[PDB]
Amino acid sequence: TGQEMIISNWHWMTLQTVELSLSFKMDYFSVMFIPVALFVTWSIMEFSMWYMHSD
Amino acid sequence: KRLFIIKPSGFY
Amino acid sequence: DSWDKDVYPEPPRRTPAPAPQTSLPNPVTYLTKIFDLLVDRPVTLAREFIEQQHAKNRYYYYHREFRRVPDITECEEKDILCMFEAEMQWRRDYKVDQEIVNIIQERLKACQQREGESYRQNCAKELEQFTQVSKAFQDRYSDLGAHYSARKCLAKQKQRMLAERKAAKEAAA
Amino acid sequence: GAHLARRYLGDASKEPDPLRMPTFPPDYGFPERKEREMVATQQEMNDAQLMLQQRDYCAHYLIQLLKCKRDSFPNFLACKHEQHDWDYCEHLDYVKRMKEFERERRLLQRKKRREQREAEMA
Amino acid sequence: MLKIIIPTTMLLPMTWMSKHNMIWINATVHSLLISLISLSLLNQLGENSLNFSLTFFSDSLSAPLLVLTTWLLPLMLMASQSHLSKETTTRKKLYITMLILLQLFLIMTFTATELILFYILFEATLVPTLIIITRWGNQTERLNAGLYFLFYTLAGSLPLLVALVYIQNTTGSLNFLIIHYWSHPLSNSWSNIFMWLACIMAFMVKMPLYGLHLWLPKAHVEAPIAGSMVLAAVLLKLGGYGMMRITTILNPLTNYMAYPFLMLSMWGMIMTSSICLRQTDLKSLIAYSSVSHMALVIVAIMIQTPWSFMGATALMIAHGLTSSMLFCLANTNYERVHSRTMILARGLQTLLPLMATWWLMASLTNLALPPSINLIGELFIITASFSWSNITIILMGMNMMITALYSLYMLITTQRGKYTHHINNIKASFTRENALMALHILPLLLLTLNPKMILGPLY
Amino acid sequence: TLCLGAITTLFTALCAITQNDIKKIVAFSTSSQLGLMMVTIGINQPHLAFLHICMHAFFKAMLFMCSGSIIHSLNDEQDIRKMGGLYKAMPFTTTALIIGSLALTGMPYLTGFYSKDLIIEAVNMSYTNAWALLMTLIATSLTAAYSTRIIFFAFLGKPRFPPLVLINENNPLLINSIKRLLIGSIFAGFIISNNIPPMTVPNTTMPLYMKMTALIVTIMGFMLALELNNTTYYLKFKYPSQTYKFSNMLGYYPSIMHRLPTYHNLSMSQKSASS
Amino acid sequence: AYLTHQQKVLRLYKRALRHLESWCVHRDKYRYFACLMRARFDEHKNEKDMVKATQLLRQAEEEFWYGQHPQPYIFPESPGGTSYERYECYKVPEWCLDDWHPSEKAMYPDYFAKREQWKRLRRESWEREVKQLQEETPPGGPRTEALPPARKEGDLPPLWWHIVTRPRERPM
Amino acid sequence: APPLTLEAIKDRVLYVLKLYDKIDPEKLSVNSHFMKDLGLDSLDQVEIIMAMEDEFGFEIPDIDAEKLMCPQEIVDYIADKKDVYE
Amino acid sequence: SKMELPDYKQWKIEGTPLETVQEKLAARGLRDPWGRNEAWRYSGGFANNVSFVGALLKGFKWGFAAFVVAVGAEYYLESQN
Amino acid sequence: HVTKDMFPGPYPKTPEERAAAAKKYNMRVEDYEPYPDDGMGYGDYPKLPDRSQQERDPWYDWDHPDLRLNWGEPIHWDLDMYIRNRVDTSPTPVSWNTMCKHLSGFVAFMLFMFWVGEIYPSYQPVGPKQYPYNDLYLERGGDPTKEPEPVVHYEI
Amino acid sequence: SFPKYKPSRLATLPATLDPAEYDISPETRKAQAERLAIRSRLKREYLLQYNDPNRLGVIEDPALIRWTYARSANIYPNFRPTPKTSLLGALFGIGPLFFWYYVFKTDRDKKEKLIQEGKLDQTFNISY
Amino acid sequence: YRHSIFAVTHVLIPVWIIHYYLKYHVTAKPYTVVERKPRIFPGDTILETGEVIPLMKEFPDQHH
Ligand SMILES: CCCCCCCCCCCCCCCCCC(=O)O[C@@H](COC(=O)CCCCCCCCCCCCCCC)COP(=O)(O)OC[C@H](O)CO
């Protein structure tokens, strides 16, 4: 579908006119990067068992 | 072959 | 809905009708179908269970109403009791005014994500509405200082009508 | 490009300056021209959420592209003829840009060598 | 406020009336109980201070500071029964009495409504701190430090005395409320400038401000551990607290008569952090770090900006919690090796695995890693200062670079590296040391979730 | 950004090809790649820059992980001048590197093709810094340069490691992890490039002789680098070239800029400041 | 105390070949150029005059400095090597074991009991080893850092505990 | 990796020593103080320890190398440096 | 196990490229002292290396073999469709 | 342990006190050298050549192997610049002046050619990117009330 | 011959290139002979304490203690005010402070001047 | 089974509480979850009114 969305959540503080809140913006850059980073680090995690075995 | 390893006491 | 669209305007959701022409199944549709019977349905079942429990006993609460009091332009000089009443009222209006710009900002940011790459044009009305709010907020409370008070807010004002009255005199020339 | 070689290493009054042109009137040189028309209205690219760069005249060969990608999910192998038509539109819009580039260069020949024609004697 | 002062005062007989070895237990548990009652005051009403009586009042500025002092009181008590246990019953009983007399003055100071009542207890903190530094201080130079500490802050406080009494006879009342509501524009007359200097210098000395800061490297290096933290964790903030409170009548003379202090502070932070890049002594390293962080607050206060004030109080308390903690780190290693030199004890992560952690996120909190409130404090000051002037970032930004290099440097030298060969008296760390470290870390990171309880009245 | 992207792309790459440590070699390859990312984001090509992020993630992770395989198996030795002849000794490790190396350097329709030469093509027909364009082309050729250095010295040739061999990669953890990333380096280039919606205007009509420069400079760079690498095979002596000294010493940056400013700032804090 | 002329030139030989590793790389090139280095080192054996030898090594060191490899091939288990002191954050000293807990101590009874055996031996050998040290100590303080060995029977060599009970180079 | 011990060390030590061409195969003894038995110039021991090094892959300090002169001596030095306890 | 050590006689100067070194210093006048030690690097199964290009076309034969069958099948079904 | 008199004192004025300081610093009178007292207050602390701990022979066994110091040896006044991880004075294979010349030259050459590249930019013999709807004034951020100025694209 | 290796305060001269170590004079014969003598004296004592079974604490290093004292309080009792120190104090003291005042005051004066005539965009700048 | 109990206690339960949070607590506040407008194209139809955006009009009909 090609929808990009923002998950704003718990309000950290209402900083007068500023509303700093924990908010997870997501778009193409996010949704594309997430599998790529996870795929690589999972493969690295599997390799790290072999290499870092005596530590 | 297994052998002793020195380690600082973590029990405390 | 709890909130209202009058102060949180939501343009109608122009959702499309999915009409695909391809032989192979669309994975997204069925991947949500399992989600419905694995996550969505148990969440709803628990939610309606706790909601009816909440409906069993419904204790209430209300919103405190502060009736208007004479402000600091009516306060006799050095009249501490009256000045104290005005200062509290001005600080009440200060915080609720901060919430006014906060509401506009949230509505301002709402358009930007909603309109996608068409943000620059779709809600040019939204940008100017915030611009007018920001400009008035500049004349209202900006530059007062860390120890701001209604007296200082009067002083900044008294600077302004003095400035524009001279401008009106200069306009008369 | 040949223009780059002849601009800095050669003359300066013949090679086009991309920052400056079009320096000559559009209707000049050739009486009457056709007008670059967009088949869609201003609403189409807005509702299609077309990005600012991808809002050229070529967008009419792109508006149905995204629909085809959606209407044929996932099927990354289709939407090739539609992309082929879009690429061919890029051919037309691009080739239009060098045609005017040669136009101005030829019009820049039209400028000086004539100016020097009535300069050494009249 | 009598729900806090009265139990604190009644705790004084409590310790003296206790048995031989039960003094530490009863004092700790009740002081912790006093801390709990202090948390009852964190709720500040909308725009009004929680005025209790004419004698005492509290607002969102002193509300976090008060509970910091009460929360501190167990921590010195938890950090003292190591070297104090080898002493007679009376002297241990006396030591507890002083800190409780210390906190009692501090509790009264932050809650005082009248600037004179503020003033009396504000200098009165010298008397218990001076004797603590001199009596139980484990060094020789401490005798010079006591003179250096006492005179330096008094040399600024005494001119302050003449300033307040002048305000009382001229303006009228002197309490924190009437001054704010009856505030009048201060002229540019040279007499007003000197009154500005008098009303300000006393508070800058206790911060301290660069140049007028040499009493920290003397006091903190050889103060007793318990006295070291309080002097580092609140007594510096005591000078800070008066800065917001007294800058209600110094307007608009603040704008022009602040440039020398801003230049002294914005340059001092680079210089003082450059001190920290090389210190032979760990405790001196921490003391100078407190100078740099406090110098940030001086910049923060002197701009007199809404955003600046909330960042000031957030950093003020946050620095106190971490600076006190790092001092506990020094005391632990100094206890094992009986020295203060950096390179003498090294590679301590291998020997002590958990202390490697405790010193680790202590350094991160000292580094203003987001979202730790050290960051939410420093970052606010940068934004306020940048609005004041665009070149402030060049200096104040460079501080975070310099602050990083030395902060990890003590982590690299002490914890990491190779264990010292000859050192062999380092036993496993007692659960008291490990617990005391947690009593500092947990409230810090716990409070990160709700900075609104530390952002002060301007929030 | 065009200026910074270009200089990072070449200078680090120039300091790469003269090093004798795979970890240093592959790292400098990243920074040269990171320099390449800053070039494309420079001339209004943000999405394709992010495409380059994904493809670079795939093959560059394998290279280090593949280099991790050889380092540990051959008793934690990292100097490239000592391994030698790993082609038939470790088939999968040698197989992974050549696919990874080719993807990083070119090889159309592989992972690097859907990102790199598109960036090179995009930066070609644009109003860019003429000097910065020259750096990208040279560094693109230099990308193949150190790639040959790794393949030639490590895997090709005669072996040089200590006599007791411990070469082994049969552990399923190493084989499966490499294979999982390997299939990514073959197809993930085609997948997302055909899957993500077109987020940039395409470049279709350019002369043939800069549409191919991306392949040309890499193939060209492949040639002399191989010839210059087997020039070491030539029995004759090799002179200690001065330019070789400059490049092999990391471009002189660490020996000065980590020693001149740190000394002064540390000296200032003691003589001034503290004392 | 003093690296004589022969000691220094051999040190020059060893370092010269190690640098030439990084240059020649391939073994066939190595065995050739090393032989030239060897042959051209053999020629100046009858140099006689020691002054010439200093002059013979005067240009040698700078010539090495001329052709020194900027990235010499240093060995991993050596200073400058990649795996230098890497396997050290695990070799906690032996004396730390005394601070263990009885529950921890009861885990390894046989080793702990044998450690106590080594503990007593050090206690008994100390007086003899310190006495042996002073009985043949040189006048005017120790002149050479080398320590005397165990002369008679039974007595252990002085200053042995830390050398013998040093942590293993591969503790893990 | 299976750790090395004496019979491993000794066999590898006499391995490279035998491979040296000038060393006489029958003259190879673990207790042979080189030059006084096998004619070897002072410039040769400093270069054969490199072969001794490359056999075991750990650098032999020149201070220890000049003292290291016997096939038994190399075996003893290698074992203790690589914490070989058998 | 025991790691039985290979015998000594399998390593001489012949065959290896170290041959070309031998007559060099022999013409110079000296003799190579370490020739036999390095023979194993250039000999045994460790010899007959692969050229640089040879490594790059690894799997070309069966890779191209997978081509012709694949293209032949797709040529047949598409043309007959 | 150590007594008070062994603590560092004032400048050694007479050679006799120079010898006493050298003994106090566990050195001899030959190698002892007080810092040049320009008033900086170095006292009698013996200045030592700028030698980072990296300079010290790693193969030698030290009492403090991490930093390469032995017990009692009078360490440098400037130890913390010259520790193993801090500033290192190791001899580079090439001269520092040459070290600096090539660094500054390459950076200056890179910057200079970058400027001349900007002076004569590279582009294809192609023209403007023709854009419809009077250069999309409306969606560029323009105001609807202010009508766009006449802009049109033609064809040949 | 390649160019020589000139030394620097940051790029030191190696022992292999130093002319001084080339000529080992009989005067230097004993000069570098007591090096081991004093080192062994420090050595033999150090191992004796280090190996001592009775030792439980740390062995105090007089050089370390002296260094801490020298880099500390024992500086002003050796401080003599001279034009070098006096100028150095002013140059690294009042100098930067006034220079920082000049740049900030100049910019701040220019900053408020633009606001005075309304020559700065702060329409959206409301938080301060 | 070891894959099954991993799924339930590390995906099934965590997705349950997150969805419940995202469906009845945080989405109960305005402008908390904002998404891009549903990108429709000329020719298709929309749901909330059942209206058809018109088909793309006659194309200048070019070919390659
Ligand atoms: C270590 C030295 C001090 C450190 C720095 C401390 C702060 C610097 C300034 C110190 C000022 C101390 C005296 C100020 C008293 C209160 C100031 C006040 O209320 O303002 C008056 C400021 O008036 C003054 O004259 C105040 C004193 C000015 C400074 C002269 C004395 C102070 C400096 C010397 C003594 C202190 C230094 C120690 C010396 C050993 C306004 O009164 P007025 O002058 O308008 O009165 C009406 C009419 O004009 C007649 O007075």
Q: What DSSP state is assigned to residue F43?
A: T
**Residue C16, beta-bridge partner list:** L46
Rounded CA gap, H28 and H31, in Å? 9
Rounded CA gap, L7 and E362, in Å? 37
The secondary element (H helix, E strand) that includes residue G41 is: helix G27-42
Distance from CA of J154 to the nearest CA of C (A): 26
* Nearest residue to G137 (alpha-carbon basis) of K48, J2, J1: K48
Q: Are E74 and E30 in contact (CB under 8 A)?
A: no
**Ligand 1 midpoint to CA E196 (Å):** 9
State the catalytic residue, choosing from H41, H44, H54, H64. Answer: H41
Chain E residues in contact with G90 (beta carbon < 8 A): 350
Q: What DSSP state is assigned to residue J154?
A: E
Tokens found for residue F11: 């200078």
Q: What DSSP state is assigned to residue E175?
A: B
Contacts 24+ apart (CB under 8 A), E429-434: E429/B12, E429/E332, E429/E352, E429/E354, E429/E355, E430/B12, E431/B12, E432/E78, E432/E81, E432/E82, E433/E328, E433/E332, E433/E355, E434/E354, E434/E355, E434/E358
Phi-psi domain of F231 (left: phi exceeds 0; alpha: psi -120 through 50; beta: other): alpha
Q: What angle do CA E316, E322, E326 make, to 5 degrees?
A: 140
Q: Are E137 and E222 in contact (CB under 8 A)?
A: yes
Q: Do F233 and G26 touch (CB under 8 A)?
A: yes
Q: Do G31 and I21 touch (CB under 8 A)?
A: yes
Rounded CA gap, G146 and K44, in Å? 9
L36 marked ligand binding residue: no
Tokens found for residue E196: 């500005």
Q: Are D8 and J120 in contact (CB under 8 A)?
A: yes
Q: Tell me whether the omega of the peptide bond preceding residue F202 falls within 30 degrees of 0, making it cis.
A: no
Q: Do F156 and I41 touch (CB under 8 A)?
A: no
Does D94 reach chain L within 8 Å, measured CB to CB? no
* Nearest residue to A20 (alpha-carbon basis) of A28, A32, A12, A10: A12
Is the CB of E195 inside a 6 Å radius of any atom of ligand 1? yes
What does R_g of chain B's alpha carbons equal in angstroms?
Answer: 10
Q: Is K52 helix (H, G, I), strand (E, B) or coil?
A: coil
Distance from CA of H49 to the nearest CA of G (A): 9
- The tokens 């279709």 sit on which residue? F204
- The tokens 């059942």 sit on which residue? L50
Q: Is A5 helix (H, G, I), strand (E, B) or coil?
A: strand
Cα-based distances in Å from J22 to C140, J15, J34, J47, J68: 75, 10, 9, 12, 22
Q: Do C92 and E305 touch (CB under 8 A)?
A: no
Chains B and D share 3 or more Cβ pairs within 8 Å: no
Rounded CA gap, C44 and C54, in Å? 15
Does G53 reach chain H within 8 Å, measured CB to CB? no
Q: Are F217 and F9 in contact (CB under 8 A)?
A: no
Cα-based distances in Å from D78 to C52, D81, F161: 51, 8, 52
Q: Are F111 and F58 in contact (CB under 8 A)?
A: yes
Rounded CA gap, L58 and E56, in Å? 83
- The tokens 């930066």 sit on which residue? F123
Q: Residues 6 or more apart from G3 whose CB is under 8 A from it?
A: G11
Q: Is F21 helix (H, G, I), strand (E, B) or coil?
A: strand
Residues I41, I42, I45, I49: is their CA dihedral positive or negative? positive
Q: Are E68 and E317 in contact (CB under 8 A)?
A: yes
Q: Is A24 helix (H, G, I), strand (E, B) or coil?
A: strand
Q: Are F167 and F74 in contact (CB under 8 A)?
A: yes
Rounded CA gap, C86 and E181, in Å? 11
Q: Are C19 and D73 in contact (CB under 8 A)?
A: no
Residues C23, C25, C26, C27: is their CA dihedral positive or negative? negative
The secondary element (H helix, E strand) that includes residue E365 is: helix E353-366
Rounded CA gap, E174 and E179, in Å? 6
Helices (H), chain F: 2-16, 22-42, 46-73, 91-105, 116-124, 130-150, 172-195, 208-211, 213-233, 242-248, 253-257, 260-269
- CA-nearest residue to E246 within chain C is C147
Q: Are E427 and G99 in contact (CB under 8 A)?
A: yes
Rounded CA gap, E222 and E387, in Å? 40
Rounded CA gap, C117 and C111, in Å? 11
* Nearest residue to F99 (alpha-carbon basis) of F90, F116, F111, F88: F111
Helices (H), chain I: 19-28, 39-42, 52-56, 60-80
Q: Are D56 and J129 in contact (CB under 8 A)?
A: yes
Q: Is H64 a catalytic residue?
A: no
Q: Are E400 and E368 in contact (CB under 8 A)?
A: yes
Tokens found for residue H15: 């391995």
Q: Which of G71, G83, G170 to mutate to test the interface with F (most CBs of F within 10 A)?
A: G71
- The tokens 């074992």 sit on which residue? H79
Q: Residues 6 or more apart from I78 whose CB is under 8 A from it?
A: none
Q: Do A17 and C116 touch (CB under 8 A)?
A: no
Instruction: From E151, E190, E191, E246, give the residue whose CB has the most ligand 1 atoms within 8 Å, as the site to mutate.
Output: E191
Q: What are phi and psi of K79, to 5 degrees?
A: -90, 120
Instruction: From E188, E195, E199, give the residue whose CB has the most ligand 1 atoms within 8 Å, as the site to mutate.
Output: E195
- The tokens 């301002």 sit on which residue? C108
Is the CB of E250 inside a 6 Å radius of any atom of ligand 1? no
CA atoms within 13 A of residue J76's CA, in its CB half-sphere: 16
Q: What is the number of CB-based contacts under 8 A between chain A and chain C? A: 18
The secondary element (H helix, E strand) that includes residue E226 is: helix E225-230
Q: Is K9 helix (H, G, I), strand (E, B) or coil?
A: coil
CA atoms within 13 A of residue B11's CA, in its CB half-sphere: 12
Q: Is A25 helix (H, G, I), strand (E, B) or coil?
A: strand
Strands L33-35 and A23-25, bridge-based pairing:
unpaired
Cα-based distances in Å from E345 to C20, J68, J121: 72, 15, 60
DSSP string across J1-59: ---GGGS--S---SHHHHHHHHHHTTS-TTT--B---SSB--TTPBP-----TTTS-TT
Is the CB of E159 inside a 6 Å radius of any atom of ligand 1? yes
Cα-based distances in Å from E58 to C116, F34, G166, L62: 49, 55, 62, 80
Rounded CA gap, G109 and G87, in Å? 27
The secondary element (H helix, E strand) that includes residue A6 is: strand A5-8
**Ligand 1 midpoint to CA E188 (Å):** 15
* Nearest residue to G161 (alpha-carbon basis) of J129, I37, K49, E313: K49
Rounded CA gap, E44 and E63, in Å? 8
Residues H64, H66, H67, H68: is their CA dihedral positive or negative? positive
DSSP string across E122-162: HHHTHHHHHHHHHHH--SSTHHHHHHHHHHHHHHHHHHHHH
Q: Residues 6 or more apart from J53 whose CB is under 8 A from it?
A: J67, J68, J69, J82, J83, J84
Tokens found for residue F242: 């001065």
Rounded CA gap, L50 and L64, in Å? 37
Total Cβ atoms within 10 A of residue I73: 10
Amino acid at K102: Y
- The tokens 């996870």 sit on which residue? A38
Q: Are E250 and E144 in contact (CB under 8 A)?
A: no
**Residue E175, beta-bridge partner list:** E114
DSSP string across F54-115: HHHHHHHHHHHHHHHHHHHHTTT--BGGG----TTTSHHHHHHHHHHHHHHH--TTSTTTTT
Strands L33-35 and D34-35, bridge-based pairing:
unpaired
Helices (H), E251-346: 253-256, 259-276, 282-303, 306-337
* Nearest residue to F144 (alpha-carbon basis) of F58, F6, F32, F269: F32
Tokens found for residue E414: 């002490």
Number of H helices, E strands in chain L: 2, 1
Q: What are phi and psi of J46, to 5 degrees?
A: -75, 120
Q: Do J64 and E412 touch (CB under 8 A)?
A: no
Tokens found for residue I18: 């170290």
Q: Which atom of ligand 1 is nearest to the CA of E163?
A: 16
Q: Are F242 and F7 in contact (CB under 8 A)?
A: no
Cα-based distances in Å from L62 to D60, D61, D84, D90: 12, 10, 12, 12
Tokens found for residue C54: 């909440």
* Nearest residue to F76 (alpha-carbon basis) of F161, F1, F138, F11: F161
Q: Is E112 helix (H, G, I), strand (E, B) or coil?
A: strand
Rounded CA gap, H53 and H81, in Å? 12
- The tokens 């193949």 sit on which residue? F144
Tokens found for residue L23: 């469906």
Cα-based distances in Å from E441 to E290, E379, E438, E445, F4: 18, 21, 5, 6, 42
Q: Residues 6 or more apart from J135 whose CB is under 8 A from it?
A: J148, J151
Q: Is E56 helix (H, G, I), strand (E, B) or coil?
A: strand
The span from the first CA to the last CA of chain F, in angstroms, equals 43
**Residue K79, beta-bridge partner list:** J40
Give me the residue from A4, A6, A19 closest to C105, CB to CB: A19
Rounded CA gap, L28 and L5, in Å? 32
- Resolution, in Å, please? 3.6
Q: Residues 6 or more apart from E109 whose CB is under 8 A from it?
A: E118, E121, E122, E124, E125, E238, E241
Q: Whose CA is nearest to atom 4 of ligand 1?
A: E156
Q: What are phi and psi of A6, to 5 degrees?
A: -120, 130
Residues E44, E45, E46, E52: is their CA dihedral positive or negative? negative
Q: Residues 6 or more apart from K65 whose CB is under 8 A from it?
A: J2, J7
Cα-based distances in Å from J107 to F221, H25, J100, J104: 25, 61, 11, 5
